[PDB]
């Protein structure tokens, strides 16, 4: 209304809740720690109830226009021999409403829906304090600003969570694996083709799709090693290179091109476990509160649903945040649990055994496809108008 609402983080959840807040009569302000919007990341899937929300948000056609268009998927051994080849569907469309899109393309689409929302980059909070009346936010500039409501949308490593919640109110559960992805020059000359090689509890992929000049690389692997500083990019890259030192295939050609990449991403595959996602005038959304991990395939869809419900409950409560936050926690809990359980289930076998029976792999793959459809629909959305 006139309420001062700060949204921390311009990823998926933060821009999404800004759209809903703006639509529902509020005037949010958005901040991003980085200098500009971060567009790295693998393809993600808009699935289940999130496809309905994308439609209501007015972005479904735009997402469809930016769908991935891989025509040929090959699984190869470390010498490059093709073990199995899959081909895409006609027109690059599924028969259902699901759509695969690069994360960066989705983030661009979301930011276009909130052109009327102030967004400040290079803004980083160093201190947060709240009383019964205001949230006091001190920035690295030295600025100090008071807000009625602060929404943490700042990802699995949420600074907002760290500054507001006691360490015993949240756990980061490592699921035993890591993910890295980045773009490099398309030195193989791939054309709408994805190559993937799996060995020794490790997976390496490389594709080129809609930009013929660039290729996107992906690395996933099991490891119990924990970094000294999970945010230290030098340590991340050294760990990635050590891990794949003897993998062979294209791994050295890819890793040797990381200095030419402007969108490097690396993170542990982890869940955020909390009994409540709010404290006083502070609410967490998306990965900051309930990251289901990349192995769920659902982080962006949980972010969509969380943004919608929190914004709606704030509208229904006529800006009475205590009531809205209570409803938010209650209405989202079952859906978060279902999606997190599915991520845990996938983690129990992902890359765990070097060689798996074909019969076993096929039954596992079929069950996962059935389960993810159920999980993605496991909520009844409230209506807010
Ligand atoms: C660059 C990038 C690439 C990713 N690639 C993948 C991928 O390939 N696969 C996958 O499964 N998940 C990936 N993720 C995570 C994925 O986006 C989430 O799992 C989910 O889809 C969206 O959750 P989110 O918006 O809550 O968090 P995020 O997408 O992580 O967005 C958090 C945002 O908050 C910003 N931020 C962080 N700290 C602060 C701070 N202190 N102050 C202000 N802003 C801050 C970040 O810069 C970012 O823009 C990626 C995230 C990022 C940021």
TrEMBL record:
InterPro entries documented for this protein: FAD-bd, FAD/NAD-bd_sf, FAD_aromatic-hydroxylase
Key words, A-Z: FAD, Flavoprotein, Monooxygenase, Nucleotide-binding, Oxidoreductase
Domain FAD-binding: 4-314
Enzyme class: oxidoreductase
SUPFAM superfamilies reported in the protein's UniProt record: FAD/NAD(P)-binding domain
Transmembrane segments: none
Gene3D superfamilies listed in its UniProt record: D-Amino Acid Oxidase, subunit A, domain 2, FAD/NAD(P)-binding domain
EC number: 1.14.13.114
Domain of life (superkingdom): Bacteria
Gene Ontology terms, MF aspect: 6-hydroxynicotinate 3-monooxygenase activity; FAD binding
Ligand binding (FAD): 12-13, 32, 38, 42, 103, 287
Matches recorded under Pfam families: FAD_binding_3
PANTHER family: MONOOXYGENASE, OXIDOREDUCTASE-RELATED
Protein name per the record: 6-hydroxynicotinate 3-monooxygenase
Organism of origin: Legionella clemsonensis
